[PDB]
Structure 1
Amino acid sequence: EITPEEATTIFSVMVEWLESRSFSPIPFPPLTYKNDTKILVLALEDLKDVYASKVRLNASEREELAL
């Protein structure tokens, strides 16, 4: 449904915004990223928040809790 001219104007105003704000791009996380294990323990406390109170566990929930 998107015409090419719409797509080029979208990309043009996004380049215009991200350069008007001098936005440096998000890097790929390095091998030795500084805050890395804190990001990991946040992403895993986000996952155990489902599995702290429930009792009935199927194959996939038990498998990911083991992960």
Structure 2
Amino acid sequence: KAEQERQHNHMKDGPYVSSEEAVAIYTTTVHWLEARKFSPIPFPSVSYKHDTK
């Protein structure tokens, strides 16, 4: 009951994270991953050599 009321309140009272807060969080993440030179994870290939394992 509490969880349905919380879900309903999120639809009615919008995202609680502000758009400025969301952009700041996203920007911190991109700056971190660019600094760490992170290579994004690909979709698994048809012939990915570790699929069976």
Q: Which residue of 2 aligns with 1:28?
A: 43
CA deviations over 1:2-61 (Å, ceiling 9, x no partner): 0000000000000001000000000000000011100xxxxxxxxxxxxxxxxxxxxxxx
1:11 and 2:26 are equivalent in the alignment: yes
Which structure's relative contact order is higher, taking Cα pairs within 8 Å and 6+ residues apart?
Answer: 1
Number of equivalenced pairs: 38
Q: How do residues 43-54 of structure 1 correspond to structure 2 at under 5 angstroms?
A: none
- Percent of counterpart pairs with the same letter? 55
| Runs of at least 4 residues off by over 6 Å | none
The separation in 1 between residues aligned to 2:49 and 2:35, in whole angstroms, is: 29
Question: TM-score under structure 1 normalisation?
Answer: 0.56
> Match for 2:41: what amino acid?
I
CA RMSD of aligned residues (A): 0.3
Q: Which runs of 5+ in 1 are unaligned?
A: 39-67
